[PDB]
Amino acid sequence: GGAMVQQTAGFVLSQLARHRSSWNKETMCPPLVVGVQGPQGSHLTGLLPDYLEKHYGLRLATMSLDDFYLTHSDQVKLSQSEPDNPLLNGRGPAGTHDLPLLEQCLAKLKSINDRDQRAQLPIYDKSLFKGEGDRSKEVVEVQGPIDVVIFEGWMNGFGPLSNDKLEEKYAEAGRQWVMPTILLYSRSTLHSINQNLRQYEVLWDQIDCFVQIQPLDLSYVWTWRLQQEHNMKAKNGGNGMTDEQVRHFINRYMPSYELFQDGIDKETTSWRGKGLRFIVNIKREIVGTESF
Numbered sequence: 001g002g003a004m005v006q007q008t009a010g011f012v013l014s015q016l017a018r019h020r021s022s023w024n025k026e027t028m029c030p031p032l033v034v035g036v037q038g039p040q041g042s043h044l045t046g047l048l049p050d051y052l053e054k055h056y057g058l059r060l061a062t063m064s065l066d067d068f069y070l071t072h073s074d075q076v077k078l079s080q081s082e083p084d085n086p087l088l089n090g091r092g093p094a095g096t097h098d099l100p101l102l103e104q105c106l107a108k109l110k111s112i113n114d115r116d117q118r119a120q121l122p123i124y125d126k127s128l129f130k131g132e133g134d135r136s137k138e139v140v141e142v143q144g145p146i147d148v149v150i151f152e153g154w155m156n157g158f159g160p161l162s163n164d165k166l167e168e169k170y171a172e173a174g175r176q177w178v179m180p181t182i183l184l185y186s187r188s189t190l191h192s193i194n195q196n197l198r199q200y201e202v203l204w205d206q207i208d209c210f211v212q213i214q215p216l217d218l219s220y221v222w223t224w225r226l227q228q229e230h231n232m233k234a235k236n237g238g239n240g241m242t243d244e245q246v247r248h249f250i251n252r253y254m255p256s257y258e259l260f261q262d263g264i265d266k267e268t269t270s271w272r273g274k275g276l277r278f279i280v281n282i283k284r285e286i287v288g289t290e291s292f
Contacts, residue, residue: 003286004278005047008211011276012048012148013056015209018274028113028145031061033106033206035271036152037264038213040253041224045152058147061109065153066091067124068102072134085189091133092252094155094260095196098122099203106206109142109149117144155256157204157212157271159263160197166190169259178219181254190255197260209274210292212264218257220282222250265292 016032023029036045049060069091070078078095082088088095101122108119121140128134161169170187173180182190215221226246233240241249265275275292 001047001051004044004213005051007278007286007289008044008048008276009051009056011209011211012052015274016058016147019208028115030110030113031146031149033110033149033151033208035156035204035207035210036150036212037154037156037158037210038152039215039218039221039224039257040154040250041221041228044211044213045150049150052148059145061112061119061121061142061146061149063102063105063109063121063149063151065097065102065151065156066126067122068097068105069124069133069135070096070098072129072132074098075132082192084186085192087185087189087193087252087255093196093256094158094193094200097200099199102203103206106149106151106203109146110206112142112144112146118142119144151207154253155260157207157210157264157269158197158200158256158260159204159266159269160194160201161259163191163194166194166259173258180258181251182258184251185255190259193256194259205270207269207271210264210269210271210276212275212277212292214277214279216279216281216287218254221254221257222247223282224284225250 012032012034015034019032020029038044045062045064049062052058052060069075075091075096079089087093090096105119105121112119119142121142123136123138123140124133125136126133128136167187170182170190173183177183226243229240229246263269266272272292277290277292278286279288279290281287
């Protein structure tokens with residue numbers, strides 16, 4: 001109900017109206033697909049659906065990237081095929097998501113207004129296999145018609161690099177050295193994640209407009225994720241990662257922020273000119289907004 005939710009609602013409503021005006025086909029207008037990206041550390045995508053449904057009469061469906069991780073069996077196969085890549089030894093980065101399922105579900109949602117109008121979305125249970133995670137048997141039932149699809153994720157919209165450009169960033173980091181986390185990894189490990197990320201471009205191209213939460217400084221992500229783990233531990237009897245384990249956890253994600261986050265803001269994206277960025281301080285207060 002706060003400023004970010006209200007401002008994001010205004011943007012969704014305006015983008016929906018443009019989408020509906022622009023639709024130049026004989027079939028029904030598809031849902032507006034809103035991509036959402038923001039760092040580790042309720043929150044926007046937890047509050048925004050009920051706000052739009054209650055106050056603006058919209059029907060929403062939400063896709064969260066983490067619910068589309070590979071099944072545990074498939075992730076084990078991935079780890080075994082890339083034993084020297086620490087980033088692929090468990091869920092998280094590019095390559096650890098089920099891209100056929102993501103594409104199938106987004107295409108299903110995008111045809112859900114056609115005139116039968118139903119979709120099923122996966123749920124991922126991070127506690128299974130002693131915390132390694134697996135797809136749940138439970139699903140989310142979606143009943144059309146749908147005005148808006150929120151498709152959110154810590155790396156949604158992240159763009160791959162040319163080989164030369166990845167090398168450029170890796171070499172630059174080495175000449176400068178808050179150590180850049182890409183220096184924790186081999187060049188071949190980083191190239192693999194980059195190549196994995198190229199497979200997401202068909203998925204990104206299904207997004208119509210975009211909302212991004214950008215910290216003033218990438219260092220906030222560590223601080224926020226520590227707060228989150230302490231908050232969760234304080235409410236669930238004290239079960240969670242240690243501070244050191246949170247650090248190692250976030251060090252697996254930070255190279256992706258360092259290398260690929262700028263791909264959200266570039267001339268070739270499907271949401272170019274239809275993006276809203278919130279710039280936030282460490283207290284998560286909006287300190288600026290930008291369009292992209």
